[PDB]
């Protein structure tokens, strides 16, 4: 009955004030890509930054188990891009935020589905 | 010159014929700093400039590509370095890596150990090591032929890189090996290779590529680190972040360089030509299968 939850301390702790994770692995790239959430190679555009996935997940960051029963993470061994305005906490961004299942973008920070 | 708009500087070619006795590396810049772009750290910007560089050579390049990375963790452990490999590397590559301490990854698997831990079944088409003990930067001792890692790595190439296949190896005035550098005389071409981010160190990258399983060259290693040390003493790179900003041809073109079995009876001169155009490799195409040995112990009496 009992599992550590780590990404409710995580939130705590940051509203509490605390520094958010640091050392997620920024990449170089053209700032030209699609935009979209989390892709097999950098895809940021002219308003996010590209990321190393593994670097921006808190389970693989905090050394616990992924909150899926395989276990599998959805950032390992991909890109994820982050607007450059929340940039300062690739970690936070990843656990608060929603990745369209249609079009790949960040519910809210790129995914226009909802539009018309 | 406008090496400053370069990924960094490979030793020159007469520079490696030469015959110059081990001196004491001083650099002009050392303590220079390259202003790296915002955010981005050191290892990534090397890694970049180390693969910008890899992309001017011959390098083999087969569908199914194997790729194993030593010395991938950091002190923030993380790994830079194999996420910007994995950034070069074709969609699909099989990428390995290792360090002696633990960090995440993300490559396809990873192995926590000391490198003479790590057996694998399979042969690879590159080898990767930024492997260093900033131990040997003890300027008040003698300056040897290091063992260690680097009998490893020597042992490794011979065993386990498949003929075509490249190495970059990451090397110091202290941390260096003479067999390795024998060793790449065994490969259709080498050099040493210094990136213009961290041009201020005495660091480079020993890359040997398309390796042919045989001297071509007879290299005296004890020589050759003399003869790299000479360059780099009186060859002041300038420090450069430049070629940082231009990543729209970084990705490694996915050659899909033919792969054949062969049997060392069968390694022809048109063979031994093919693999030092980049144009084959010779290794086996099952499946990738990796191991690390652990030393059992029981404290407890
Ligand atoms: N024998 C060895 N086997 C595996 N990894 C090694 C070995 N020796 C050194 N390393 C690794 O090589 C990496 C070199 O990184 P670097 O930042 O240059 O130096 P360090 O991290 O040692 O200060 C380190 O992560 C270190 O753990
Ligand atoms: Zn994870
Ligand atoms: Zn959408």
New interface residues.
């Given amino acids: 009955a009992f599992a550590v939850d780590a990404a409710k301390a995580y939130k705590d702790y940051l509203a509490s004030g605390g520094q958010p994770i640091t050392?997620?692995?920024?990449?170089?790239?053209?700032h030209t890509g699609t935009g979209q959430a989390i892709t097999?190679?950098?895809e940021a555009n002219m308003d996010q930054?590209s990321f190393?996935?593994?670097?921006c997940?808190l389970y693989?960051?905090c050394?616990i188990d992924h909150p899926n029963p395989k276990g599998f993470c959805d950032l390992?061994?991909?890109?994820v891009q982050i607007p450059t305005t929340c940039?300062n906490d690739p970690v936070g961004f990843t656990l608060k935020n929603t990745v369209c299942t249609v079009c790949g973008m960040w519910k809210g920070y790129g995914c226009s589905c909802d539009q018309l | 010159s406008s090496q400053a708009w370069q990924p960094g500087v490979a030793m020159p070619n007469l520079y490696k014929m030469q015959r110059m006795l081990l001196e004491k590396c001083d650099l002009q810049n050392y303590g220079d700093s390259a202003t790296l772009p915002k955010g981005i750290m050191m290892n990534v910007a090397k890694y970049t400039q180390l693969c910008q560089y890899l992309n001017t050579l011959t390098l083999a390049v087969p569908y199914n590509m194997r790729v194993i990375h030593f010395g991938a963790g950091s002190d923030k452990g993380v790994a830079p370095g194999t996420a910007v490999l994995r950034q070069w590397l074709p969609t699909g590559t099989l990428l390995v890596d290792s360090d002696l301490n633990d960090f995440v990854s993300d490559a396809d698997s990873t192995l926590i150990g000391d490198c003479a831990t790590v057996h694998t079944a399979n042969k690879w088409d590159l080898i990767i090591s930024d492997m260093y003990d900033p131990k040997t930067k003890n300027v008040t001792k003698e300056n040897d032929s290091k063992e260690g890692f680097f009998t490893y790595i020597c042992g490794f190439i011979q065993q386990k890189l498949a003929l075509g296949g490249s190495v970059a190896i990451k090397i110091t005035e202290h941390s260096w090996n003479a067999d390795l550098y024998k060793l790449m005389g065994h490969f259709a071409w080498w050099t040493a290779f210094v990136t213009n981010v961290n041009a201020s160190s005495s660091e480079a990258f020993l890359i040997g590529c398309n390796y042919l399983g045989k001297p071509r060259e007879q290299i005296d290693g004890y020589v050759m680190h003399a003869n790299y040390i000479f360059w780099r003493n009186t060859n002041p790179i300038q420090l450069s972040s430049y070629s940082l900003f231009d990543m729209s041809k970084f990705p490694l073109k996915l050659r899909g360089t033919a792969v054949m079995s062969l049997k060392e009876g069968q390694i022809n001169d048109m063979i031994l030509s093919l693999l030092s155009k980049g144009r084959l490799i010779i290794r086996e195409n099952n499946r990738v299968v990796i191991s690390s040995d652990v030393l059992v112990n029981n404290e407890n009496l």
């Fill in positions: 050392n997620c692995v920024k990449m170089l790239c053209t097999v190679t950098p930054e190393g996935g593994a670097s997940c693989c960051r050394h390992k061994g991909k890109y940039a």
